[PDB]
Design a protein around this ligand. Structure first.
Ligand SMILES: Cc1cc2nc3c(=O)[nH]c(=O)nc-3n(C[C@H](O)[C@H](O)[C@H](O)COP(=O)(O)OP(=O)(O)OC[C@H]3O[C@@H](n4cnc5c(N)ncnc54)[C@H](O)[C@@H]3O)c2cc1C
Ligand SMILES: Cc1cc2nc3c(=O)[nH]c(=O)nc-3n(C[C@H](O)[C@H](O)[C@H](O)COP(=O)(O)OP(=O)(O)OC[C@H]3O[C@@H](n4cnc5c(N)ncnc54)[C@H](O)[C@@H]3O)c2cc1C
Ligand SMILES: Cc1cc2nc3c(=O)[nH]c(=O)nc-3n(C[C@H](O)[C@H](O)[C@H](O)COP(=O)(O)OP(=O)(O)OC[C@H]3O[C@@H](n4cnc5c(N)ncnc54)[C@H](O)[C@@H]3O)c2cc1C
Ligand SMILES: Cc1cc2nc3c(=O)[nH]c(=O)nc-3n(C[C@H](O)[C@H](O)[C@H](O)COP(=O)(O)OP(=O)(O)OC[C@H]3O[C@@H](n4cnc5c(N)ncnc54)[C@H](O)[C@@H]3O)c2cc1C
Lengths: 225, 202, 200, 225
């Protein structure tokens, strides 16, 4: 199924997007504008390197507000906290509980969990620490959306090298929907392990079903209070 | 037939400048060398250091007309059209139009409202009467895609080159032009045939 | 006629008194915003002008926000820019970004006013659909009340001239009554719209 | 054997040296100048604290170029990336995949592995986290050259306390040669565990043999393709 199918569950949600210092951040509007018609309100928090690549005044044209590091309530303001693109550095900080910029701090100050969208060249992606930190973030309850292997321009080399890049805005929207349904189903009180793994396994096989799955998981929740 | 030429791209203060990389990278495999000159508003939207990752050099408002073999302004604002159409040159982008030998290819980009303003159409027609080329935008009204932009650049180069062949006559001149306005992907084959009829009639 | 009015201030000494106009316009329009050039800000700070209107746009959207865009006072430079399609400051740009036409209130000394290029730019602006209110010989601005009457008259001019499914008869009938009583603009235009939809 | 014996393998190599905020950085010229006659080209990337101790304009007198934090291609530019002197902080960042300055980022963006030269007083060296991070860097494939116990001036105390200091420029040059031969031999395709451990064990017993060892390990590589 498609991406614009579980729109229901994002209709009233506040989305906070953290932008890190990756060259793909220059194109973040393609994500922002696409998300704009699905959430109640979208705000952005940026690192300094992201601001050096693309100014906060530019990003503000594509969302409701931009938080710059020159704001500790934004983690509670957001219903969904998504970091895209996420650098190896933000993964290292968040996986190790270090919070030196507002994006990494928002991970700790945000109530539930964070959805990361890593983006780096294949060289950095194959470093041991990066994989270790990804797996630590996953074990701590955060969600790390896998990038796709493509041949993109390498800023460093001026030629096309192998790069681990972002999924399209619709596949990202599906990833956010799926992840939200993941956390909500995982933390429903009046359910047992078999029904919970039943709802989770069908989310990993068809994420466009998130709306229908979550909607049914809530009604089996109250029926079993 | 552009692998020999130096391409200079001037960026003006439009939000579409944030996507200029999509053009720069695409052009990179067709021209000998691509450099960029920016306005201050364009730099405020997207820094010159960011653009530099996608080209050979970026000239900021902090010679280049003669360096370029082809000068393309993309995106072009209404203001840059008003300046160039009236011979006013207050930033480096407009000045390069005056300092560049031959003609300039403009890629205007504006909302549908500004495009229908009388002064804007007047300035477009003035630029066209002065020998410059103004590429029409499409409805998606935005800029054409990088592949169509490349075809338009090629077509414009072939236009100016055929129009300024010395020992050729009006009928064959419009003959080479009319087949370019009907098939721009033939620019390589037509221009190559126009030069060999040139020396054959010396 | 509770439309939104945007006023552009150019670098003229008369800008120091722009409040006398703003306040007067404020007593007719419910919402008034101002956009300034840098020179106008050097003469009178934007924070000072902000005491007399709802918001001041500085050089440190608004064309579509405004229903009526009026440049007062307008310098020779702003006339040269707007007449030639050149937009180098926010005031001149708003002329291009505004959906309809602009009302200019030129203010300059008689020397600059009698220069050929200035008259040429005025006539070019008029030929392009913009309205240029004539100054008085003192060459200064008309009083605020007459300025408000001129703004109403100009707005109704453009609105009546562009009625789609209405004919030259009723259109010239609504126009001739505007040149004789501009304070009737609100009553005239309101009657022109209802004859509009009645003749769809 | 001596240090100027395996010069062959550095003749065509580009060396990037990262300087961290240690007082020994004030004397880095003794290393730079000594290395200058052995590599094709030597560039430097500095942290802010290193720049506070010794200005980048001063270091530029002793190498080909100085990268200051006020440059993501330098990791691919370098053939060999060496961090000297390395602070406890740079070890903490690199061991945990955190990249907040250009030196630590270059570790991730550099294609192979990094050779660290730690330098700190004996007090910091005996902290548990420092040893843990050293061992983590070693387990992740990086090389950490051991400092030597001496009695040096303590900036903090104005008297001589025990300090863990750098090896001489020639022993460092040997360490770089040895480490380069280590990685190259470790990643030769057409070799088996017994021949590889044979080449490695003789590198740990005589590093001045690196040139002869690597040269032979390549010719047994192609002979076994
Ligand atoms: C053009 C370019 C593209 C890049 N693309 C990628 C990529 O796709 N993937 C990838 O993994 N890496 C990439 N990097 C490297 C990455 O930017 C560095 O690792 C950087 O240090 C991490 O940036 P960040 O936005 O995650 O955090 P940053 O906020 O950038 O943290 C480091 C930077 O922030 C500033 N800073 C100062 N104090 C602090 C503080 N207390 N907390 C936080 N920041 C501080 C510093 O000036 C420093 O440059 C790129 C670098 C460049 C120059
Ligand atoms: C987000 C945004 C998007 C826009 N998109 C479009 C569009 O698609 N189409 C369109 O026609 N118009 C657009 N405009 C309006 C356009 O930017 C203005 O008309 C502007 O004056 C055009 O500038 P330019 O890039 O043509 O040349 P510029 O060189 O930008 O023209 C002069 C401008 O540059 C700055 N500048 C020049 N020299 C200096 C200096 N020495 N110091 C400081 N500042 C200096 C000034 O602030 C001035 O506004 C847009 C404006 C904005 C804010
Ligand atoms: C005391 C005083 C009295 C005046 N009286 C009159 C009058 O009676 N009538 C009249 O018509 N005018 C008057 N002017 C304005 C003056 O005559 C000029 O015409 C002035 O440049 C008008 O500009 P502006 O008001 O439109 O402001 P703006 O359009 O903002 O003027 C442009 C300003 O930006 C700066 N600038 C320079 N280069 C650039 C660039 N490339 N891009 C952007 N900005 C640039 C300049 O310093 C200049 O002041 C007066 C000015 C002063 C100081
Ligand atoms: C004179 C002196 C000598 C020292 N000698 C030693 C030694 O021999 N061994 C040892 O282990 N420690 C030493 N230290 C302590 C060490 O400098 C600190 O731990 C320091 O924070 C690490 O410096 P660095 O060069 O590794 O990284 P730094 O780049 O120095 O990181 C911290 C410093 O960088 C600046 N900074 C700001 N934002 C960022 C960012 N996003 N990323 C990186 N840096 C940022 C800060 O101003 C801060 O002071 C010494 C300190 C001093 C003052």
């Amino acid at each position: 199924g498609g991406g614009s199918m579980s729109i229901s569950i994002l209709k009233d949600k506040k989305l906070l997007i953290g932008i890190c210092g990756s060259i793909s951040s220059v194109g973040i509007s393609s994500y922002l504008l696409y998300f704009k018609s699905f959430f109640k309100e979208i705000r952005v928090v940026m690192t300094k390197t992201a601001e050096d690549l693309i100014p906060a005044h530019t990003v503000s044209y594509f969302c409701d507000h931009v938080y710059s590091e020159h704001h500790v309530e934004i983690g509670r303001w957001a219903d969904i906290y998504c970091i895209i693109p996420a650098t190896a550095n933000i993964l290292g900080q968040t996986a190790n509980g270090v919070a030196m910029n507002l994006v990494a701090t928002t991970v700790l100050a945000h109530p539930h969990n964070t959805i990361f969208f890593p983006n780096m060249n294949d060289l950095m992606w194959n470093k041991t620490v990066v994989s270790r930190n990804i797996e630590q973030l996953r074990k701590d309850g955060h969600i790390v959306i896998e990038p796709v292997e493509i041949m993109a321009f390498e800023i460093a080399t001026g030629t096309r090298k192998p790069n681990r890049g972002l999924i399209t805005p619709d596949k990202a929207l599906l990833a956010i929907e799926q992840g939200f349904a993941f956390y909500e189903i995982l933390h429903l009180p009046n359910l047992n392990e078999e029904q919970r793994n039943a709802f989770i396994q069908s989310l990993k096989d068809d994420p466009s079903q998130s709306a229908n799955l979550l909607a049914e998981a809530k009604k089996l929740n109250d029926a079993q209070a």
